[PDB]
C-alpha cells in the first residue's frame, strides 16, 4: 500500500519541505508529528507513541540545506537517519553526482532506503524529487535510479524533475546535466512530471503578483501542484489510486512518459466556477512546462478535481471544451477524458500568498507539444558541445566523453519518437 | 499492457475481467505471438459470453492467425456448437481455409462434431472443399469408416 | 566545501594580501585583536571560510617583510606559526625563487599549509596572492602552487596574480619572470584573477587624477576588488557560492582560466562619495574599460563567461533588467555558443565607504592583449639574451625560456581562436 519519497539535491530537499509541510496541513498532522485525528498511511508510518513519520529519504552531497531541515519547524517530524548528507557537493557537475562523489555515498543511501522499505509490507514504488541542472540532482539521482531498478526492480518509480530556467539558473552547464540524467534515467523511470521553473516564475509574477519571486514562492506553488497529483494516493480517490495507474492512464509508450501538468486556479491572497477553472486547464499560461499543446497531439488526459465540485458541472465543462475547442487526439487513443474528484478543499499555508480556493483542478495530459521543452535543452546543449565547452570538467571526474554523444543521440531519438506519434 | 491482459482474460474466461479491461480501452483485436486475437482464444476454450461481447465491440470475426486459423476454425475443431452459431450469425467465413488447407467442415468432421457439421452445412459449407492431401470432408468420412458422418454430409 | 586556506608570498603578496585582510576583517566585523564587534548575522554566517583569526600563511624570502606586516594595522591577528620567511631575498630572479633559494624554504611552508588544512571540516581550495615580475612571489609561488597541486589534487587553486608594467618598475627582467610564471599558472591553477599594474596606474593617474600613484594607491584598488569577487564566497548566496562552482561556470576550457576583473565605482583613498550611483550607472561600468583591473579592452574581444556581483540594497528587479539589457544591446560581444553565460548575484551588505557597488569578473578573450604585451617585452629581451646568466646559473636551462615563450603564444592563439569562433 505504501509509497516512499526521495529528495535529491537542494531542489528535491527544499521542494520536499514544501510538500511535507503541505501534506501535514492536509492531513492535520502536527510539526511534532502528532495528530488529534487508512488512506493517508500510504505516505506516513506510525510510531507506538501515536506519532506519524513520513516515508521519506532526504539526500544532498552537502549539509547546508538538509541542516536547515533538522533545525527547523519540522525537525521533529523526520527520524535523523532519514536525513543524509555528504560534505563535498557535486559542483553543478553530473559526473561528480554520478561517478566521483555519488559512489562514495550511494551505498549509505540505498541502505537507509532499505530500512524504510523493511517497515513496509506491500511497497508500491518510489517518488523521486530532484533538479535537472544541479550536479547532485542530475548525477546522483540517475545513479540512484539505476540501483533502485536492481534492488527493487519489480516496482514503480516516479520522477518530479525541476526543468531549468535562466531566471533562477545557478549554472551554465545545466543543459548538459539535464540531458545527461534524462538519458540515463530514461529506462529506469516509469513516469516523470517536469516542472519548468520559468512557468512557475511567470505564474508567480502574474497571478500571485510578485516582482522578483524567491524559491519559497516557487516551491509553495509547486508543492500545491504536486499535492494535486499525489492527492489520489493519499485520500483513496477513484482515479490514480496506485502508482501503476499513472502509467496505465498516462503512459502509452515506455519512453514517452513525460506528462504536462496544468493547474487552476492560482488566486492571490489580496470564487470561480467549475467551468471557468476547466477552461484554464487548456490555457498555456497556467501550465507547468512552457509549450503549446495546440501544436501537438494528446496521448491521454486526466482531470483531478478537488473541492466543492458537482459531477454534472464537470461533464458540462468537459462537453464545452470537447465541442467548443479543438483538442486534437491521436487516432489510437481512447478519445475520452478520464476524471476523478476529491471533495476536500485545497489547503494552503497559513501566511501563504496563495489564497484558499473553493475548488481546484490539476489536468495531467501527455501531449506531444512537450517535445518543445526537450528541443530547447537539446539546442542549448548542441551550442556548447559543438565547441566541447565545459566538457573537461565532466571528463575529468570519471566520465567518458562518448557518454555526451550517446546521451544526445538518445535525446535526438526521443525527439523523433514524439514526432512519429504526432503525424 | 492491456492487450496482453485481455488475451489472458478471454482465454482463462474471466468475464468480468474482460469487461474491466475493455473499460480501460483494451485492444479487442490484439494479437499474441502467433496472431491469436481474444476472439480466437474465447472461441477455442468455449467462452460464449466473452465471444458475444467481443463481437459486439468490433472484433474481426474473420481474423486469421499466423497459421490462417479463423475463430470458426477453432470453434468447429474443439466442438463449441453455441459459438459456431454465434460466429456464423456475425458473418463468419464458413469456407475459410487455413495454412493446412482445412475448412471448418474438415475439423468438425475429423473430431466427430456431427451437430456442428450439420450447422456448417446449412450455412453453405463446401462439401467439395479439399485439403492439402486432396481430401474433402466426405473423403474423411469414407476413409475413416464413419457412416454416421457420411450420412450427415449427404443430407 | 567550506574553508579556504589563504597564502601570500613575496613583497606584493603580503602587501595586497594584508590589505585584503584589512578590508574583509572590517566587513565581517573583526577587530585587530580578533574579536567580533559586528551587529549582523549575515557577517558571521560564513566567517568560517576565511577565519577560525585568519587562515592565512605569510611567506617571503625577504625577512624584512615579516615586520612590515606585523607593524601594519591588522598585523597582530595573524598566527605567529604561519609566518615562514627566509634569510636572504630572491632579487627579481625567478630561478632563485623556483629552483634554488625559494625551493629550500618551500617545505617549511607546506608544513604550515598542511597544519591549517588538517583542521578543516571540508576544504574548498587555496588562495595565493603574489606578483609575477618578482623572484619570490612568482618563482616560489608557482613552485608552491605545483607542490600543493600534487599534495592536494582534490582541491581548487585560485590566485590573485599581479602583472608587471614598466609604469611601476623599470626592472627589465620582469618580462622573463612573468612569462615563466604564466607558463606555470596555465597548467597549475583552476582560476587566476589578472591584476595589471599597467591598468592600476592608468586608473589612479587618469580616472582618480593622482599625479604620482604609490603602491598604497594601487593596493587600494586591489583590496577593494578582492573583497568584491569574494563576496559570494563570504556571505550567504545562491549563485557562484563555492570556488569549484564558480570555476565550473567561469572556465569552459582548462587553459583559458584568466579572468579580467573590474569593479565600480572607482574611489580614491578615503575620499568622500556623497552621490551614490544608480543601478543603470553601475551596470554601465562593465564594458567601461576604465574600470578593468587588467589593461585590456573588452570591446576588442568577446566574453566567454561573466560573473556580476552587486553589493548593497537595491532593486533585484532593476539589476536583472539592466543586465538582461546590456547583454542583448551588445549581443555581438558575448559569445553565442555559450547560452546564459552571464550570471548576476546580489549581496545586501555593501562594501566599506559605499552605498552601492558592483564587481565584474569576466573571462574575456581580449585578455590576449595582456599576454601579447608580456610576450613582446619577453622576446625583445630574450632575442638579445640579456640577463640570462642569472637564470641559467641557478640551474635553469635556456630551453625553458623558449618553451614558456611558445606556451604563452599558444595561450594567446587559443584566445584568438575562440574569439573568431562562430555558432552558425
Ligand atoms: N523550483 C525550484 N528550483 C530549484 C530549487 N532549488 C534549486 N532549484 C533549481 O535547481 C537547479 C540546480 O540547483 P540544485 O538542485 O540546488 O543543485 P544540486 O541538486 O544541489 O546539485 P549540486 O549543488 O551541484 O551539488 C537550479 O537551476 C535551480 O534553479 C527549489 O527549491 N525550487
Ligand atoms: N600592485 C602592487 N604591485 C607591487 C607591489 N609591490 C611590488 N609590486 C610589483 O611586483 C613586481 C615586483 O615583485 P615583488 O613582489 O616586489 O618581488 P618578490 O618579493 O620577490 O615577490 C613589480 O612588477 C612591482 O610593480 C605592491 O605593493 N602592489
Ligand atoms: Mg546543492
Ligand atoms: Mg621582497
Coordinates of N, CA, C and O in Angstrom, one line a residue, chain C residues 203-255:
Chain C
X203 N 44.5 53.9 -13.9 CA 43.3 54.3 -13.3 C 43.6 55.3 -12.2 O 42.8 56.3 -12.1
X204 N 44.6 55.1 -11.4 CA 45.0 56.1 -10.4 C 45.4 57.4 -11.1 O 45.2 58.5 -10.5
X205 N 46.1 57.4 -12.2 CA 46.6 58.6 -12.9 C 45.5 59.3 -13.6 O 45.3 60.5 -13.5
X206 N 44.7 58.6 -14.4 CA 43.8 59.3 -15.4 C 42.4 59.4 -14.8 O 41.8 60.5 -15.0
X207 N 41.8 58.4 -14.1 CA 40.5 58.5 -13.6 C 40.5 59.1 -12.2 O 39.6 60.0 -11.9
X208 N 41.4 58.8 -11.3 CA 41.5 59.3 -10.0 C 42.3 60.6 -9.9 O 42.3 61.2 -8.8
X209 N 43.0 61.0 -11.0 CA 43.8 62.2 -11.0 C 44.7 62.3 -9.8 O 44.7 63.3 -9.0
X210 N 45.6 61.3 -9.7 CA 46.7 61.3 -8.8 C 48.0 61.3 -9.6 O 48.2 60.3 -10.4
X211 N 48.8 62.3 -9.5 CA 49.9 62.5 -10.4 C 51.0 61.5 -10.2 O 51.6 61.0 -11.2
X212 N 51.3 61.1 -8.9 CA 52.2 60.0 -8.6 C 51.5 59.0 -7.8 O 51.4 59.1 -6.5
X213 N 50.9 57.9 -8.4 CA 50.4 56.8 -7.6 C 51.5 56.1 -6.8 O 52.5 55.8 -7.4
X214 N 51.2 55.8 -5.6 CA 52.0 54.9 -4.8 C 51.5 53.5 -4.8 O 50.4 53.2 -5.4
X215 N 52.3 52.6 -4.2 CA 51.8 51.2 -4.1 C 50.5 51.2 -3.3 O 49.5 50.6 -3.7
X216 N 50.4 51.9 -2.1 CA 49.2 52.1 -1.4 C 48.0 52.5 -2.2 O 46.9 52.0 -2.0
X217 N 48.2 53.4 -3.2 CA 47.1 53.8 -4.0 C 46.7 52.7 -4.9 O 45.5 52.4 -5.1
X218 N 47.6 52.0 -5.5 CA 47.3 50.8 -6.4 C 46.7 49.7 -5.5 O 45.8 49.0 -6.0
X219 N 47.2 49.5 -4.3 CA 46.8 48.4 -3.4 C 45.3 48.7 -3.0 O 44.6 47.7 -2.6
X220 N 44.9 49.9 -2.9 CA 43.5 50.2 -2.5 C 42.6 49.7 -3.6 O 41.6 49.0 -3.2
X221 N 42.9 49.9 -4.8 CA 42.0 49.3 -5.9 C 42.0 47.8 -5.8 O 40.9 47.2 -6.1
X222 N 43.1 47.2 -5.5 CA 43.2 45.7 -5.5 C 42.3 45.1 -4.3 O 41.5 44.3 -4.5
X223 N 42.6 45.6 -3.1 CA 41.9 45.1 -1.9 C 40.4 45.2 -2.1 O 39.6 44.4 -1.6
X224 N 40.0 46.3 -2.7 CA 38.5 46.5 -2.9 C 38.0 45.5 -4.0 O 36.9 45.0 -3.8
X225 N 38.8 45.3 -5.0 CA 38.4 44.3 -6.0 C 38.3 42.9 -5.4 O 37.3 42.1 -5.6
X226 N 39.2 42.5 -4.5 CA 39.2 41.2 -3.9 C 38.0 40.9 -3.0 O 37.4 39.9 -3.2
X227 N 37.7 41.9 -2.1 CA 36.5 41.8 -1.3 C 35.3 41.7 -2.2 O 34.3 41.0 -1.9
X228 N 35.3 42.3 -3.4 CA 34.2 42.2 -4.3 C 34.0 40.9 -4.9 O 32.9 40.3 -5.0
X229 N 35.1 40.3 -5.4 CA 35.0 39.0 -6.1 C 34.8 37.9 -5.1 O 34.2 36.8 -5.4
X230 N 35.2 38.1 -3.8 CA 35.0 37.1 -2.8 C 33.7 37.3 -2.0 O 33.5 36.7 -0.9
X231 N 32.8 38.2 -2.5 CA 31.6 38.5 -1.8 C 30.7 37.3 -1.7 O 30.1 36.9 -0.7
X232 N 30.5 36.6 -2.9 CA 29.8 35.4 -3.0 C 30.3 34.3 -2.0 O 29.5 33.7 -1.3
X233 N 31.6 34.2 -1.8 CA 32.2 33.2 -1.0 C 32.0 33.5 0.5 O 32.0 32.5 1.3
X234 N 31.9 34.8 0.9 CA 31.9 35.1 2.3 C 30.6 35.4 2.9 O 30.5 35.5 4.1
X235 N 29.5 35.5 2.1 CA 28.2 35.8 2.6 C 27.2 34.8 2.0 O 27.5 34.2 1.0
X236 N 26.0 34.6 2.6 CA 25.1 33.6 2.1 C 24.6 34.1 0.7 O 24.3 35.3 0.5
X237 N 24.4 33.1 -0.2 CA 24.0 33.4 -1.5 C 23.9 32.2 -2.4 O 24.6 31.2 -2.2
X238 N 22.9 32.2 -3.4 CA 22.6 31.1 -4.2 C 23.7 30.8 -5.2 O 24.1 29.7 -5.5
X239 N 24.2 31.9 -5.9 CA 24.9 31.8 -7.1 C 26.4 32.0 -6.9 O 26.8 32.8 -6.1
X240 N 27.2 31.2 -7.6 CA 28.7 31.2 -7.5 C 29.2 31.1 -6.1 O 30.0 31.8 -5.6
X241 N 28.6 30.1 -5.4 CA 28.7 30.1 -3.9 C 30.1 29.6 -3.5 O 30.8 30.3 -2.7
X242 N 30.6 28.5 -4.0 CA 31.9 28.0 -3.7 C 32.9 28.1 -4.9 O 32.5 28.3 -6.0
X243 N 34.2 27.8 -4.6 CA 35.2 28.0 -5.5 C 35.0 27.1 -6.8 O 35.2 27.6 -7.9
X244 N 34.6 25.9 -6.5 CA 34.5 24.9 -7.7 C 33.3 25.3 -8.6 O 33.5 25.4 -9.8
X245 N 32.2 25.6 -8.0 CA 31.0 26.0 -8.8 C 31.4 27.3 -9.6 O 31.0 27.4 -10.8
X246 N 32.0 28.3 -9.0 CA 32.5 29.4 -9.7 C 33.3 29.0 -10.9 O 32.9 29.4 -12.1
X247 N 34.4 28.3 -10.7 CA 35.2 27.8 -11.8 C 34.4 27.0 -12.9 O 34.7 27.1 -14.1
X248 N 33.4 26.2 -12.4 CA 32.6 25.4 -13.3 C 31.9 26.3 -14.3 O 31.8 26.0 -15.5
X249 N 31.3 27.4 -13.8 CA 30.5 28.4 -14.6 C 31.4 29.5 -15.2 O 30.8 30.4 -15.9
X250 N 32.7 29.5 -15.0 CA 33.6 30.5 -15.5 C 34.6 30.0 -16.5 O 35.0 30.8 -17.4
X251 N 35.0 28.8 -16.4 CA 36.1 28.2 -17.2 C 35.6 27.1 -18.1 O 35.3 26.0 -17.7
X252 N 35.4 27.4 -19.4 CA 34.9 26.4 -20.3 C 36.0 25.5 -20.9 O 35.8 24.4 -21.3
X253 N 37.3 26.1 -20.9 CA 38.4 25.3 -21.4 C 39.6 25.5 -20.4 O 39.9 26.6 -20.0
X254 N 40.2 24.4 -20.0 CA 41.0 24.4 -18.8 C 42.1 25.5 -18.8 O 42.4 26.1 -17.8
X255 N 42.8 25.7 -20.0 CA 43.9 26.6 -20.1 C 43.4 28.1 -20.0 O 44.2 28.9 -19.6

